[PDB]
Amino acid sequence: MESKRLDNAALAAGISPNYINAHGKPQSISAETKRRLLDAMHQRTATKVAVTPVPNVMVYTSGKKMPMVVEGSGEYSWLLTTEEGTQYKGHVTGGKAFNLPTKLPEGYHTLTLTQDDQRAHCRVIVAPKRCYEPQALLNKQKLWGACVQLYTLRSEKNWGIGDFGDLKAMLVDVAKRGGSFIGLNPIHALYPANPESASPYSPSSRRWLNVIYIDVNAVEDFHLSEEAQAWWQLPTTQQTLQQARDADWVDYSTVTALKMTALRMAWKGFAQRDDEQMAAFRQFVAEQGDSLFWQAAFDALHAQQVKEDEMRWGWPAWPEMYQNVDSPEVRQFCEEHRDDVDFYLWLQWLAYSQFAACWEISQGYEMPIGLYRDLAVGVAEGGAETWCDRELYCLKASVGAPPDILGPLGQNWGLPPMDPHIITARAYEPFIELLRANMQNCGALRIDHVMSMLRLWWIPYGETADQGAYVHYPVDDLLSILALESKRHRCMVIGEDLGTVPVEIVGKLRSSGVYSYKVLYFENDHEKTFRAPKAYPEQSMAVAATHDLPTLRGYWECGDLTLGKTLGLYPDEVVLRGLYQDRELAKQGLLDALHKYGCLPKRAGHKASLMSMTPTLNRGLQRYIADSNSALLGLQPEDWLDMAEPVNIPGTSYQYKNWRRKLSATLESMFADDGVNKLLKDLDRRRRSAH
Numbered sequence: 001m002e003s004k005r006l007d008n009a010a011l012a013a014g015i016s017p018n019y020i021n022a023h024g025k026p027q028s029i030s031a032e033t034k035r036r037l038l039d040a041m042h043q044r045t046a047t048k049v050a051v052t053p054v055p056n057v058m059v060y061t062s063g064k065k066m067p068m069v070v071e072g073s074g075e076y077s078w079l080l081t082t083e084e085g086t087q088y089k090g091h092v093t094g095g096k097a098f099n100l101p102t103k104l105p106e107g108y109h110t111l112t113l114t115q116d117d118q119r120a121h122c123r124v125i126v127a128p129k130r131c132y133e134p135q136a137l138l139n140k141q142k143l144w145g146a147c148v149q150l151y152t153l154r155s156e157k158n159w160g161i162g163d164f165g166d167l168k169a170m171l172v173d174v175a176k177r178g179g180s181f182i183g184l185n186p187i188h189a190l191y192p193a194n195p196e197s198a199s200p201y202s203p204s205s206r207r208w209l210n211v212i213y214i215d216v217n218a219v220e221d222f223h224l225s226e227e228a229q230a231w232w233q234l235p236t237t238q239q240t241l242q243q244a245r246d247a248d249w250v251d252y253s254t255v256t257a258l259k260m261t262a263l264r265m266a267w268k269g270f271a272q273r274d275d276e277q278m279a280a281f282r283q284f285v286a287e288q289g290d291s292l293f294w295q296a297a298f299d300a301l302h303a304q305q306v307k308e309d310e311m312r313w314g315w316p317a318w319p320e321m322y323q324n325v326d327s328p329e330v331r332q333f334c335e336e337h338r339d340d341v342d343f344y345l346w347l348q349w350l351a352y353s354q355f356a357a358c359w360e361i362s363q364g365y366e367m368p369i370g371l372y373r374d375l376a377v378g379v380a381e382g383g384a385e386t387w388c389d390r391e392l393y394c395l396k397a398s399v400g401a402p403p404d405i406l407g408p409l410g411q412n413w414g415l416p417p418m419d420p421h422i423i424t425a426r427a428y429e430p431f432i433e434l435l436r437a438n439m440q441n442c443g444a445l446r447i448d449h450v451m452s453m454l455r456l457w458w459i460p461y462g463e464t465a466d467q468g469a470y471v472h473y474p475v476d477d478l479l480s481i482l483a484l485e486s487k488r489h490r491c492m493v494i495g496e497d498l499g500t501v502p503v504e505i506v507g508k509l510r511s512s513g514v515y516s517y518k519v520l521y522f523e524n525d526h527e528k529t530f531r532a533p534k535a536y537p538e539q540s541m542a543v544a545a546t547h548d549l550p551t552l553r554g555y556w557e558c559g560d561l562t563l564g565k566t567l568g569l570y571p572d573e574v575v576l577r578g579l580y581q582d583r584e585l586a587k588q589g590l591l592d593a594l595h596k597y598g599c600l601p602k603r604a605g606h607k608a609s610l611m612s613m614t615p616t617l618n619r620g621l622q623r624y625i626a627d628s629n630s631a632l633l634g635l636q637p638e639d640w641l642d643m644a645e646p647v648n649i650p651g652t653s654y655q656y657k658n659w660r661r662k663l664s665a666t667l668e669s670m671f672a673d674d675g676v677n678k679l680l681k682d683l684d685r686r687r688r689s690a691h
Contacts, residue, residue, distance in 0.1 A: 003031055010034040013041060014420055016470035022408035029469040036460040040396035042419050053113045054122040057427035059477045062126050066100035076113040083107035123427040130513030131486035131493045136368040137631050142690045144633035145181030146174050149547055149647055151250050154666040157217055160244030160255045164354040165215030168361055173671045175365035178684035183372040183634055193302035194313050195256035198659040201376050204383030207437040208295045209351035216259055221266040228265040249660040267343050281349050296344035297334055298384035314382020325388050359441040371442035377449040378415035392430055394419050397458045400465045410465030417456050420473045428481055439489035450495030453478045454505055479512045494541050516540035520625055528589030533597055533628040542630035552621050553613045553644040558583050567655040584609060599623040618642055619679060626686035640676050641665055
């Protein structure tokens with residue numbers, strides 16, 4: 001294809017023809033990038049031989065006219081069955097639109113037109129305008145919660161990694177202190193056969209759960225299996241376990257080896273049940289269908305593959321015969337090793353159940369939100385999701401971010417993008433299942449990179465991010481479906497919207513009931529004048545920091561910059577000097593603002609370069625966001641413990657032990673501490689004085 005033909009095909013496929021570059025100038029995408037992203041997509045060539053009477057899907061907002069346009073000509077008879085079962089019938093002529101019956105309920109309906117034999121179906125979705133909000137926020141209350149990295153939690157009972165047992169126990173302590181929720185890192189299924197690949201942000205699947213979180217103590221068949229107690233009783237077992245627990249860093253390998261060994265024995269007992277339990281399990285499997293089966297089959301197969309060779313990190317590294325789920329050899333494996341598949345099914349049932357148990361406690365204590373999950377932006381190229389539904393993803397591209405003024409190289413996130421053409425061709429089925437998997441048993445959901453609904457930066461496989469382009473998604477339809485599912489689950493939505501958001505979309509997100517995300521470190525203008533607490537928008541969540549950033553102490557001590565220098569991340573000493581100065585001005589403006597908006601004692605110093613971190617300053621930084629007009633406050637425990645050390649350093653691969661740094665204290669210890677209890681009672685009061 002020559003330029004101008006291609007230019008049109010690209011445009012019609014939803015590929016934006018340009019972007020604002022790192023010098024602020026608009027820049028055209030190359031013809032090569034266009035060629036390669038078209039080839040990456042899954043479009044069907046239209047024959048226009050008798051194009052369809054109505055589209056395969058239509059989305060409407062409730063309380064409005066619903067003009068449905070009908071192509072062709074001659075009389076068509078239409079049947080509209082609601083989700084509830086209600087039937088509407090009529091006739092219509094092609095080339096003339098007709099309005100759907102008014103006052104249709106929200107949900108998922110089916111319109112069917114008929115002429116002679118020929119039937120056409122259209123999924124008709126009726127959505128509310130806004131996502132759901134708890135009564136507490138409708139009544140303008142200001143709530144707070146703990147935002148934790150689940151794996152970092154220490155306790156007297158766990159096996160060397162925070163898990164659902166600890167989550168359940170922490171819900172209680174948080175709730176007794178006026179806490180409204182606990183927020184989580186993404187708990188998406190990862191790789192038990194490759195436990196050391198621990199980033200929650202390259203998951204196997206975004207529908208299933210990370211099984212390392214199972215609380216083995218809570219598993220009845222662990223206790224009943226003689227074989228398992230013999231194993232638990234070994235001195236090498238109790239020594240291995242003690243060391244895993246005592247370590248300051250999560251040993252994923254060891255903990256995984258311990259849990260799988262124990263659970264494999266527990267399974268031998270469970271597999272013989274003929275009771276409520278086995279009934280509940282088998283019904284779970286049935287209701288969840290093939291997506292679950294392929295997840296379990298993946299993990300079962302992966303377990304074997306690492307034995308043959310430990311470099312088989314994912315499916316693209318497996319012998320090619322195992323890269324197709326319908327091959328004779330995958331079929332053979334599944335018949336023969338059904339028990340193994342069954343085992344991994346059971347693990348998902350345990351994780352599901354235990355997460356439900358946590359959710360049930362939070363509602364017992366009447367927490368307005370209770371549990372607050374995080375949905376990563378995509379899946380890894382070599383996990384279970386792309387393995388069994390390859391059409392849905394475009395493996396010849398990676399999602400990332402473009403070059404901009406802040407980062408002139410841009411980023412590559414290494415995630416194959418979901419294909420917008422398949423999303424729509426399947427009537428949004430994959431977007432619905434994704435929300436249904438991530439909204440259940442919880443009262444809030446965080447959408448990583450909520451801009452993903454307008455567009456993503458697609459990079460042709462194995463190229464630098466400058467060779468990318470923005471590829472668009474049906475934002476309106478997705479924002480409607482988001483609202484609909486949000487309301488159906490009674491699960492409010494927080495849209496992570498750091499970085500650039502076109503003004504247009506800020507508006508849509510706000511009126512769609514999505515909550516904004518605000519980080520203290522970033523909420524200052526170019527002059528480091530910090531935003532006033534009362535100017536934080538009502539419809540937002542306020543946090544001091546995130547897992548990608550320094551803790552309050554790390555920030556204040558420039559520990560990120562210093563440690564960064566130590567690990568080779570800042571080779572350019574000029575750029576580094578800039579970042580120090582930039583930090584010191586940031587610190588000064590922040591200190592000015594703490595004093596100004598009444599977060600500190602009178603005696604506290606006013607010059608920031610002379611100050612080190614103290615309990616008073618630690619408290620002040622948190623009061624600042626607690627006094628904010630943001631409806632929700634997220635507090636890191638790392639900051640209650642006054643921890644200096646980060647949990648992830650973006651840009652590192654091996655240089656830092658990312659996703660491993662444990663909290664410096666256990667739950668029991670933390671919640672028995674005077675300072676912690678005083679801090680939280682102060683902060684909880686500050687939320688109450690904020691109206």
